[PDB]
């Protein structure tokens, strides 16, 4: 029932921290982002990952560094994890350069192209907008697509929220829960709890009242075939 975690290392954790964009993209500085990158790096380090933090990557950078990571040897790793922090739009995250489809980023790790992650969980946490809707609230051959989990900060077609001073809500919530339960809850329990937190704990504060008092719900997509605990535990 659980993924085998009995490996030399837990695995690699790549963090892409995109804060600054070319003006031509029309995207703004994402203040709050450096906090998220730090809290995430500290958190994933605690879990046991080898965390690497990249900053302000172009789209060609983002493709290449991810392609290479899938071309490494993960034979002694229990899993792999990638965290993206950027602007986005449906199906697509921004580099500083422009826009690239998420599917192209993650496909490098399909079973048929990163054979050493075959049968192991490959996790992606994505803090990015996914279009422009606002939520108002209300009062054994293995499938090559097997074993991914994508934890998006928000549901398709919606914006995602970031506090310049405190961090994105998704990330704040995630870290918070991972700190108290990283080592003792199953991954879905963790993310369910992160769902509850982003939903219960945050509400937009804004001058423009079009953007005022909005809510958010994250969106977890699981192709996993087993339960995942981070502690051999």
């Amino acid at each position: 029932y659980q993924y085998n975690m009995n490996f030399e290392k837990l695995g690699k954790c790549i963090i892409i921290n995109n804060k600054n964009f070319d003006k031509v993209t029309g995207m703004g500085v994402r203040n709050g982002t450096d906090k998220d990158a730090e809290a995430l790096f500290k958190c994933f380090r605690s879990l046991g990952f080898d965390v690497i933090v990249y900053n302000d990557c172009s789209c060609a950078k983002m493709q290449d560094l991810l392609k290479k990571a899938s071309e490494e040897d993960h034979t002694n790793a229990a899993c792999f994890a990638c965290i993206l922090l950027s602007h986005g739009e449906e199906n697509v995250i921004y580099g500083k350069d422009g826009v690239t489809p998420i599917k192209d980023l993650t496909a490098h790790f399909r079973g048929d192209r990163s054979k050493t992650l075959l049968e192991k969980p490959k996790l992606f946490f994505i803090q990015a907008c996914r279009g422009t809707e606002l939520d108002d609230g209300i009062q054994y051959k293995a499938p090559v697509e097997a074993d991914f989990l994508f934890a998006y900060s928000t549901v398709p077609g919606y914006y995602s929220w970031r506090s310049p001073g405190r961090g994105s809500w998704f990330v704040q919530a995630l870290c918070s829960i991972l700190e108290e339960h990283g080592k003792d809850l199953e991954i879905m329990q963790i993310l369910t709890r992160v769902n509850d937190r982003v939903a219960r704990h945050f509400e937009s504060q804004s001058d423009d009242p079009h953007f005022h008092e909005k809510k958010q719900i994250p969106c977890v997509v699981s192709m996993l075939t087993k339960e995942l605990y981070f502690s051999q535990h």
Partner: peptide
């Protein structure tokens, strides 16, 4: 608060 700002949007991504």
């Amino acid at each position: 608060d700002e949007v991504x």
